[PDB]
Every structure is written in C-alpha cells, then in structure tokens.
C-alpha cells in the first residue's frame, strides 16, 4: 500500500472524478467541453468537421482501454501497457 501525505484534493465537477495533481484535472477538463456542433454519442468527442466524426465513431469498437497515467485510449490492451513503458518511460 502507498504511504504518503496529501494536502488538498482536486475533484472534477463534471464526472465526479479526482486527481492528485492539478495539471491533471485541468487537462482532463478538456473532454468536458462542447463547442462543436457535431458531438459524439459514445464520448464527449466533438469536431467542427463532419467526416472526422464518422471516422472517429469507428474507433468505438466494444470497449476501449484508457491509460491509468494519462487520458490515452487504445483499441487494444497490450498496446496501452507498452504506451506507458515507452511514453511514461524512457528505459528499456
Ligand atoms: Zn471530469
Ligand atoms: Zn467518441
Ligand atoms: Zn499514458
């Protein structure tokens, strides 16, 4: 079990989420923004373009795997793991 201190906490007033760091919540709020006319039914994915959406939707194939560190989503699982060892890591 992790053992450390904790002053304050950052809670998201959108999806009742929580983030240890601040920058995490800020960048996260990104998905919590609807300024485009075309919105995605699956997620909060929106784009002024029409095609972009059509292609995006295709991405939704059952269940995606979101990164524990960042908000990176991948179709496969194994890839996600490597993404954390390559992106969130620079040591073989
Ligand atoms: Zn949120
Ligand atoms: Zn979507
Ligand atoms: Zn990641």
From Swiss-Prot:
Binding, Zn(2+) 2: 40, 43, 56, 60
Superkingdom, taxonomy of origin: Eukaryota
Residues where Zn(2+) 1 binds: 12, 15, 28, 32
Subcellular localization(s) per the UniProt record: Nucleus; Cytoplasm, Cytosol
Residues bound to Zn(2+) 3: 67, 70, 83, 88
ZnF region ranges: C2H2-type: 10-32, 38-60, 65-88
Tissue specificity note: Isoform 1 is strongly expressed in placenta, spleen, kidney, testis and peripheral blood leukocytes. Expressed in CD4+ and CD8+ T-cells, CD19+ B-cells and CB14+ monocytes. Isoform 3 is strongly expressed in placenta, ovary, tonsil, CD19+ B-cells and CD14+ monocytes.
Function comment: May be involved in transcriptional regulation. Overexpression causes down-regulation of a number of genes involved in the immune response. Some genes are also up-regulated.
Name of this protein: Zinc finger protein ZFAT
Gene responsible for this protein: ZFAT
Residues represented out of the complete protein: 269 to 353 of 1243
């Amino acid at each position: 079990g992790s053992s450390g201190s904790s002053g304050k906490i950052f809670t998201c007033e959108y999806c009742n989420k929580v983030f240890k760091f601040k920058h995490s919540l800020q960048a996260h709020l990104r998905i919590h923004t609807n300024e485009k006319p075309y919105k995605c039914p699956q997620c909060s994915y929106a784009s002024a373009i029409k095609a972009n959406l059509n292609v995006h939707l295709r991405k939704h194939t059952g269940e995606k795997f979101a990164c524990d560190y960042c908000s990176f989503t991948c179709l496969s699982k194994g890839h996600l793991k490597v993404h954390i060892e390559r992106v969130h890591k620079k040591i073989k």
